[PDB]
Amino acid sequence: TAGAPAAPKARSCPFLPPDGIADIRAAAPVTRATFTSGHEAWLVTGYEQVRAVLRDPSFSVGVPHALHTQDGVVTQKPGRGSLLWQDAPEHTDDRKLLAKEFTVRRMQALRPNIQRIVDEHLDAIEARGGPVDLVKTFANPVPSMVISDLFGVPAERRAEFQEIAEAMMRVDQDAAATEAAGMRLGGLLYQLVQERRANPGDDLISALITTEDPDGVIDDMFLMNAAGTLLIAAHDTTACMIGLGTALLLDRPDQLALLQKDPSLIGNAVEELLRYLTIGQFGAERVATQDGEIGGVRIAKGEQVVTHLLSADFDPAFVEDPERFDITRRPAPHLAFGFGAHQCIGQQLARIELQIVFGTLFRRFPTLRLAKPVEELRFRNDMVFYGVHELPVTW
Ligand code: HEM
Ligand SMILES: CC(C)(c1ccc(O)cc1)c1ccc(O)cc1
């Protein structure tokens, strides 16, 4: 046909973006391409233009196609309180309500909880010795357990929360509301909400229950949608970064050795891991709602746009020598958490989880190493979030 060329996806090097991106970004940071669905849309690859799209409040997240799926069909989505598919003014109002209780202060307060969760999972790995799959024993279970503490889940209920979260982790966030595992999570959340109403606590769900609700928006469905969305948005993504960050650090002993010599670099290292790895691999989707202009290219009403966060995090106009992994950079504002109104709401919590996971993993296991070469690893090449399927490690 006369379709624009396929958006680059192949990687000859598994810790770098797809090979084709650089040449496009440099010549044409706003261009057309054809995505997995067969549809064509704008492909924005340069840092500055990705930020211009994402900060413009007239783009909508209600898109006509699902470009990264085979059939392109946009499935049915959850309602108010789920955020990801809402637009203003409802998105603005619902996010501000959730953010009233889901505060950066509540996220910092979870530090000790996180440290305990991280330490228990490593004592079990330790008690039974190498080799082990880090993905299954550590990267998958830790982030949902963090969230279960966020939600006040008591210890007798954890095994069931973890099993259900794990089934959901295998499903894409876009498909949750129309999959079976979604129903099983719905039933758990309905029940969790009733328990908290009956027995309030210090946790997030208890606080939302009694938050100041002038417009009368908070009912059980809103709460289930918010909790559900927090869990699903936090679990797969943070698990992928744990597994993929671990693999990259294990494959860069020079950067690892810097961190072991000066552990106060943990902050900076986490920022460079996020930039370098930008796990949302295929690009975020928006649709224009009015005519506009990005990078001197006219964008029309109804046109879909894909902001390629990975490509933009490797743009040489953003940082010097982008293909170099260097944990001593001064953090610059990467796009691994997005930008603008829909930017990751859990950014601060995810940073804490990763700082604690990598601080502690390398402090307790300085001899950690791969039990198989990086070319035998199997990467998540076709998944929404990039990472490793398995990460066998020893010490
Ligand atoms: C505690 C963990 C996390 C929680 C609770 C969380 C929560 C969320 C939620 C609710 C949203 C939707 C926000 C909205 O539309 O208003 C979101 C967006 C996003 N999150 Fe997270 N997140 C977590 C961790 C992560 C991690 C580890 C990453 C990436 C490495 C990530 C990347 C994103 C990105 C890119 C977006 C924006 C998508 C877009 O605008 O199209 N998040 N996050
Ligand atoms: C599990 C969840 C409550 C849900 C919502 C609606 C639904 O029909 C089925 C399941 C859900 C899914 C996805 C999400 O982003 C928020 C909440």
Side-chain angles (χ1 to χ4, degrees):
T1 33
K9 296 178 36 166
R11 297 175 193 235
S12 46
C13 285
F15 297 109
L16 286 181
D19 297 77
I21 283 299
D23 346 20
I24 288 139
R25 178 179 53 237
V30 180
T31 201
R32 319 247 323 152
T34 289
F35 289 91
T36 304
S37 72
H39 301 89
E40 182 178 291
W42 292 108
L43 164 63
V44 182
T45 47
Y47 177 95
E48 179 196 356
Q49 293 78 28
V50 167
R51 287 182 128 200
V53 170
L54 294 181
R55 77 161 59 83
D56 178 337
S58 65
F59 287 87
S60 161
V61 291
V63 296
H65 323 282
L67 306 168
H68 302 133
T69 64
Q70 301 305 138
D71 59 23
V73 169
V74 171
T75 49
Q76 275 185 194
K77 299 296 179 255
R80 294 192 69 163
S82 64
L83 303 184
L84 269 78
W85 301 290
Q86 294 190 246
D87 280 336
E90 296 162 33
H91 165 84
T92 310
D93 299 351
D94 295 351
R95 191 175 157 124
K96 180 185 225 295
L97 211 40
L98 173 55
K100 192 92 53 35
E101 311 291 345
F102 190 51
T103 50
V104 174
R105 209 235 321 286
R106 176 184 300 276
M107 292 176 228
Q108 309 217 234
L110 283 177
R111 249 196 224 84
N113 298 256
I114 297 163
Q115 186 68 56
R116 279 186 312 270
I117 289 154
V118 165
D119 278 320
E120 282 145 16
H121 286 75
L122 301 168
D123 297 335
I125 273 158
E126 190 167 58
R128 67 201 201 69
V132 296
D133 175 23
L134 210 53
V135 172
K136 183 34 54 59
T137 51
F138 180 73
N140 289 354
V142 165
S144 51
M145 184 144 278
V146 163
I147 295 291
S148 75
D149 265 38
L150 175 75
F151 289 172
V153 173
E156 71 258 31
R157 306 199 132 291
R158 290 179 141 192
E160 176 197 24
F161 188 93
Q162 293 290 84
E163 181 179 21
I164 287 173
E166 193 202 19
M168 197 64 25
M169 179 181 39
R170 284 158 218 309
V171 164
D172 298 327
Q173 183 136 26
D174 283 2
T178 54
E179 282 290 317
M183 295 291 131
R184 191 184 173 188
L185 180 58
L188 184 68
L189 296 178
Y190 175 93
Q191 176 178 271
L192 193 146
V193 172
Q194 302 316 306
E195 279 169 40
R196 298 289 175 280
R197 264 179 205 291
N199 293 105
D202 283 349
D203 62 286
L204 180 62
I205 299 320
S206 302
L208 294 165
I209 281 151
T210 57
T211 199
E212 310 71 46
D213 186 17
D215 286 25
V217 149
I218 304 231
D219 66 5
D220 279 357
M221 199 56 37
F222 181 104
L223 291 166
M224 277 174 288
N225 281 340
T229 248
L230 290 178
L231 173 68
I232 295 159
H235 189 182
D236 199 16
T237 53
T238 310
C240 284
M241 279 291 304
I242 292 169
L244 191 64
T246 295
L248 175 58
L249 281 168
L250 262 27
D251 173 80
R252 303 280 163 106
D254 56 313
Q255 301 287 306
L256 186 53
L258 280 158
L259 185 63
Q260 304 272 249
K261 171 158 150 204
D262 185 10
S264 70
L265 279 178
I266 187 75
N268 278 12
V270 170
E271 301 303 303
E272 180 79 332
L273 286 161
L274 291 156
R275 174 188 82 83
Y276 206 75
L277 297 177
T278 306
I279 54 159
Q281 57 182 329
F282 296 134
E285 312 180 73
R286 302 289 191 276
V287 65
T289 68
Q290 64 193 23
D291 290 331
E293 184 150 84
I294 295 298
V297 178
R298 298 293 313 191
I299 306 301
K301 209 269 274 146
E303 291 184 328
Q304 183 154 349
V305 179
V306 169
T307 58
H308 207 280
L309 304 171
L310 180 56
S311 157
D313 277 347
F314 283 75
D315 176 345
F318 162 46
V319 287
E320 140 226 279
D321 197 28
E323 305 192 359
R324 189 187 79 246
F325 182 52
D326 177 359
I327 72 178
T328 75
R329 301 174 195 266
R330 160 176 297 89
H334 63 74
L335 289 160
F337 291 118
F339 197 59
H342 278 90
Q343 269 190 290
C344 173
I345 205 180
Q347 265 180 249
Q348 297 298 285
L349 183 69
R351 282 172 166 109
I352 294 168
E353 295 195 57
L354 292 178
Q355 286 162 10
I356 289 176
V357 163
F358 300 114
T360 296
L361 177 68
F362 290 113
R363 176 175 59 67
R364 291 188 46 189
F365 296 76
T367 62
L368 191 75
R369 53 166 207 95
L370 304 154
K372 285 172 210 210
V374 34
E375 46 274 347
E376 286 194 88
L377 286 191
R378 291 165 302 122
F379 292 78
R380 292 160 53 114
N381 301 114
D382 298 325
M383 295 181 87
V384 177
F385 299 114
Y386 195 59
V388 292
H389 287 292
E390 197 192 318
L391 190 59
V393 299
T394 194
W395 71 91

